[PDB]
């Protein structure tokens, strides 16, 4: 599929959000990761959300991702036992 080595970056992952609470505002993704890779809201990406979707300012990821939707993610904050997996989303996301 779409994902041979990366692009002179940090490897990149392609996997669904698995996790989303409300609560906390951010999605765990399952992409073989042990610790699932955590993507804060505040972060998202317009692909998440879809470019036919009308956005001004920040997204509400309760309603803007979903399980079973995947992303582009690389992670930017390591496990450490306290942080986990972080996605970033400085990847090229977010088609409009």
């Known amino acids: 599929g779409s994902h041979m080595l990366e692009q002179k970056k940090a490897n990149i992952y392609k996997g669904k959000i698995t996790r989303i ?4 505002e951010a999605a765990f993704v399952d992409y ?3 610790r ?3 993507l804060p809201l505040k972060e998202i990406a317009r692909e998440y959300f ?3 979707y009308s956005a001004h300012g920040r997204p509400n990821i309760k309603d ?3 399980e079973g939707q995947e992303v582009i993610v690389q992670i930017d904050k390591e496990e450490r036992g306290n942080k986990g997996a972080a996605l970033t989303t400085f990847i090229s996301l977010a088609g409009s």
């Open 21 to 24: 609470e409300p609560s906390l």
């Open 32 to 34: 073989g990761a042990e």
């Open 36 to 38: 699932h890779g955590f």
């Open 50 to 52: 879809p470019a036919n």
């Open 64 to 66: 803007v991702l979903r």
